[PDB]
């Protein structure tokens, strides 16, 4: 550091300040600002380059804001007991075992052992903890990993419901397939296409919501050389993720969670039904189609 | 040098020494030494090294040395051979498990921690931290070979699985071996399944 | 999961070889096969991975009387593959009967790579319609892999034979193969020779050696359509979620393809979208209009510009199309590929359901009917006569494709509450 | 204890000489024999140690009508050995009768090195199956050293004659020698000419001078298989503990061999294990599968990586094998050798019981049967007729190897609670 090298200069300024018989703000500001610039530069000189700040942000984004898609498809495929209630006596070990096993499937032979899967169903109690290098990064506090994990759990729920609906689509593939099949209740007015759309569109929205700020935040860090500026940029990044992802307490957020559980009930019915068969699905189906129309009217409150 | 000679006196050449004792008098072993349980062995280490090496450190070497002799006893009791075919089927049901145990003890414990320990002892800048880095090998090797914690809940079944080699050695009946095996192997597994978590590497066998 | 590709026909084997050449240029391997240390990318869905440093592409190479396969051997890519599956007619029925008699050993070749990998997703069929050696045999194995495995996905790469009228037996062959693609494949990627020949004559000065150029055009298309699967995107980066968005009706699974660089031998998103919607940047040849479009982008793309660009096409009245559902136009984003020389950085895709192709179908439904009145152009092959003595299976296939045309003509209108 | 090697046959004497050349390059001796002061290693199990500064390898050199042994003399290794045991047919029976008539003096040569050393562990037989001079004689002495000493171990180095059909008397000879190896040897290390010829044509460009290259390949194998005994490891560093782990059934003692450098003319453990399991890095040519595998490593190997690597093969489903016991795959570690130029630092071994070789056996059990129907290819030698007038001992050996094939086919399945 050049802190010791310019130590005597700042010492001369503060020694000059005591000899002066008058207190003025104009000089006192100048000494504290001149010290502040170089010390924030001293932090910035280490954190960006030898701690790989720009490099660690992509790791955070990949494992955490669901910037990767291989692990978070392979994990939900090989987990079947986190849909049920966990006793949290066997499952808390089993989730990280399954996590590292699923990460082993394609690549990831370089480390990927820093995360930990903790349990407090078992999806809503699943939590990812990512311990950071605390002397080499004080930008990553306990509070920011706390906000970050709220983002993690909400995006996992969306991932589950859309994977369910796209896998349960096999009308074309198996059920009309060398089959003739009289269809007047075998069709459900094909609302499977509609329930895709309300999960698809939000989805595309998320691709903007991550990428516009993430491109900006790896840009601002390049321009400035004081760590204090990067703190403001990061504290705008987090609030933008929260507000644009609609996580904030609204009637709209309650509506989105209701959309999600409604899609899960749709997926359960069409999973259990089978290829063409009547098992008194009509009652649950009627409740479902009326409820979907009711909630689709509520999403027009924002459109007006 | 005395450390390298020390860790070579347990774990080659000395296996042929024990196998003759398999096939008992206490002065006849002495001249062969100069060439189930209960043995004593120690060596004279000079006075300038007896301020880093201690008296109870000899005892910790004796305890771990005896437990190595029990595993070598088991491996030679299955090496003594080379009802029609039913005996051979009870060999493969055994020869797997015990071999994995030997494969765990040499490689994963006494060759990983020793290779780790050698890389630290050459970094000794001081008399004091040499004693310290030696004791944090002693007190953890007395933990990894289990002789100080939950020994009447884990180590007792490890004592019970060695008896199957004895009953297999006697017959030269057979169903009473697989009943005890399916008892004690699951009794090991149903306790370790809670887990230090390294104990699943020998219980996937 | 992993996707197995099967190529037959001489033209199909050629374009499969050129496609694997294009992917060897794409992926982190050398032309011998050996790994290069310059490299993000996944080589698992199309390449079997040993540690023999020569990652073998997951291709099943079948043939009849190998002629061009000898030219496939004399190449530096002969160390990329050797799964030993090379084995030694003229019509659909003769090729179908020849595929019938040897089904056990070729299906053993199929069962070999089926047992070779543990996860299985889809089968890509690289096939030319009414191609002679490809026709009959390809329809037969298409029927068999759909009948044997109903849990997997069936995709096809297929060109359309059009020469504007010579082969007199082609409408029968294409008619039967179109029945088999509609009932034994879940999605078909349709190309024709004529529009690519037209675009090739537009960009270059070519008349005679057209085949060598259009192969390059096709391979650029098939690599582009797989860039979202090979490089990890988050939307439709599996085959199943990709096909699940593109089918509004289970009789309609034919996808229109375009490519925004018409010649490669700065940009904002509204520019390439508007260039994309033009019929000259489209590769496939009353009111006829799209039902639903998916466009895929590859390049240096700012995220907010795509929203403005979609708003632009909304304001242009370039949407003069009107199906009966609110299933709409679709944008997607994937990255431009690193690791190779990449000219013309931002390039586009379209995957769309368009009914103009039905005109192409009814041209075949015209031609066969005329020959059905004449009865002098069936060529009366002996296995063709033994396989069907009355030739009523072609009439039944004509009935099925007539119902397909009626369903297309009903799907054009905003009135599909009744069946067409 | 100490292990005595016996080599017969011209090809066997050649590969024994090349093996001792390889070990003279290995051990701390000069090509004259004189000790070098550059050197950990033990020279006692294969080399008699005097103080004549020329440590004599423990080899018994027997022959019939020495031709290539003269070429063995014209060498700088003529001062390495002189135990004076060189002594001056075409079939198994003629060679057996010729070994019968002179048994006393060759067994005196055996009793000489038996009394020469005090500790005795094993006899290695370096022998070629159906080799002419080696066949008959080698089976005879195999019977005699097992009958005379039941406390020692019998190992064999043996190649398999395969030329894809010329010698018409080879199935009789190999059939009888296989009976004698199954009943008069406790373990047999099996090689064939064909797979090493295939690997040699893969690595080099060789057609005619193949013998000079495959000898080098064999010698690298036999040195590698002895590195765990010559250099002190702690697992199976005696012969007895090595063979005691590899035999699940006393009729099965044939060991499959591989070598991870396929060409030598960075690495982690999962890489060389996965490269090891491939059949191209294997040196020996329905469901056929291993019963139990032992793999041996030589190189700069970190100890925790081997545990992860074994976990990797467990997760790959490369274990598509299923015998009837939990006796499992086996890893072992030994050091790479110092004191010589050592390229390709980490190299592997496998020692495995595989039943694919039974197909090789039944090919011989096919061929002899056809000749048994024809009765024109026994060649009717006079000592062959006097040794067996009815030729029913070949029929009894066929019965024994048929029971061996049935026991193999029972050992393949997970159902060996009943005898096969």
UniProtKB/Swiss-Prot annotation, chain A:
It comes from the Eukaryota. It is found in: Cytoplasm, Cytoskeleton, Microtubule organizing center, Centrosome. Ubiquitously expressed. It is linked to Microcephaly and chorioretinopathy, autosomal recessive, 3: A disorder characterized by congenital microcephaly and chorioretinal dysplasia associated with poor vision and nystagmus. Variable ocular anomalies include microphthalmia, retinal folding, retinal detachment, optic nerve hypoplasia, absence of retinal vessels, round areas of chorioretinal atrophy, and attenuated electroretinogram. Most patients have mild developmental delay and mild learning difficulties. Belongs to the TUBGCP family. Component of the gamma-tubulin ring complex (gTuRC) which mediates microtubule nucleation. The gTuRC regulates the minus-end nucleation of alpha-beta tubulin heterodimers that grow into microtubule protafilaments, a critical step in centrosome duplication and spindle formation. Component of the gamma-tubulin ring complex (gTuRC) consisting of TUBGCP2, TUBGCP3, TUBGCP4, TUBGCP5 and TUBGCP6 and gamma-tubulin TUBG1 or TUBG2. TUBGCP2, TUBGCP3, TUBGCP4, TUBGCP5 and TUBGCP6 assemble in a 5:5:2:1:1 stoichiometry; each is associated with a gamma-tubulin, thereby arranging 14 gamma-tubulins in a helical manner. Gamma-tubulin at the first position is blocked by TUBGCP3 at the last position, allowing 13 protafilaments to grow into a microtubule. This is Gamma-tubulin complex component 4. It comes from Homo sapiens (Human). The chain holds residues 298 to 631 of 667 of the full protein.
Swiss-Prot record, chain B:
It is found in: Cytoplasm, Cytoskeleton, Microtubule organizing center, Centrosome. Widely expressed, with highest levels in heart and skeletal muscle and moderate levels in brain. Component of the gamma-tubulin ring complex (gTuRC) which mediates microtubule nucleation. The gTuRC regulates the minus-end nucleation of alpha-beta tubulin heterodimers that grow into microtubule protafilaments, a critical step in centrosome duplication and spindle formation. Belongs to the TUBGCP family. Component of the gamma-tubulin ring complex (gTuRC) consisting of TUBGCP2, TUBGCP3, TUBGCP4, TUBGCP5 and TUBGCP6 and gamma-tubulin TUBG1 or TUBG2. TUBGCP2, TUBGCP3, TUBGCP4, TUBGCP5 and TUBGCP6 assemble in a 5:5:2:1:1 stoichiometry; each is associated with a gamma-tubulin, thereby arranging 14 gamma-tubulins in a helical manner. Gamma-tubulin at the first position is blocked by TUBGCP3 at the last position, allowing 13 protafilaments to grow into a microtubule. This is Gamma-tubulin complex component 5. It comes from Homo sapiens. The lineage of its organism: Eukaryota, Metazoa, Chordata, Craniata, Vertebrata. The gene is TUBGCP5. The chain holds residues 718 to 1016 of 1024 of the full protein.
Swiss-Prot record, chains C, D:
Phosphorylation at Ser-119 by BRSK1 regulates centrosome duplication, possibly by mediating relocation of gamma-tubulin and its associated proteins from the cytoplasm to the centrosome. One of its GO terms (biological process) is microtubule nucleation. GTP binds at residues 130-136. It is found in: Cytoplasm, Cytoskeleton, Microtubule organizing center, Centrosome; Cytoplasm, Cytoskeleton, Spindle. The keyword GTP-binding applies. GO terms for molecular function: GTP binding; identical protein binding; microtubule nucleator activity; structural constituent of cytoskeleton. InterPro entries: Gamma_tubulin, Tub_FtsZ_C, Tubulin, Tubulin/FtsZ-like_C, Tubulin/FtsZ_2-layer-sand-dom, Tubulin/FtsZ_GTPase_sf, Tubulin_C, Tubulin_CS. The modification Phosphoserine is found at residue 119. It holds the Pfam family Tubulin_C. Keywords: Cytoplasm, Cytoskeleton, Disease variant, GTP-binding, Lissencephaly, Microtubule, Nucleotide-binding, Phosphoprotein. SMART domains: Tubulin, Tubulin_C. One of its GO terms (cellular component) is cytoplasmic microtubule. PANTHER family: TUBULIN. Tubulin is the major constituent of microtubules, protein filaments consisting of alpha- and beta-tubulin heterodimers. Gamma-tubulin is a key component of the gamma-tubulin ring complex (gTuRC) which mediates microtubule nucleation. The gTuRC regulates the minus-end nucleation of alpha-beta tubulin heterodimers that grow into microtubule protafilaments, a critical step in centrosome duplication and spindle formation. Component of the gamma-tubulin ring complex (gTuRC) consisting of TUBGCP2, TUBGCP3, TUBGCP4, TUBGCP5 and TUBGCP6 and gamma-tubulin TUBG1 or TUBG2. TUBGCP2, TUBGCP3, TUBGCP4, TUBGCP5 and TUBGCP6 assemble in a 5:5:2:1:1 stoichiometry; each is associated with a gamma-tubulin, thereby arranging 14 gamma-tubulins in a helical manner. Gamma-tubulin at the first position is blocked by TUBGCP3 at the last position, allowing 13 protafilaments to grow into a microtubule. Belongs to the tubulin family. The gene is TUBG1.
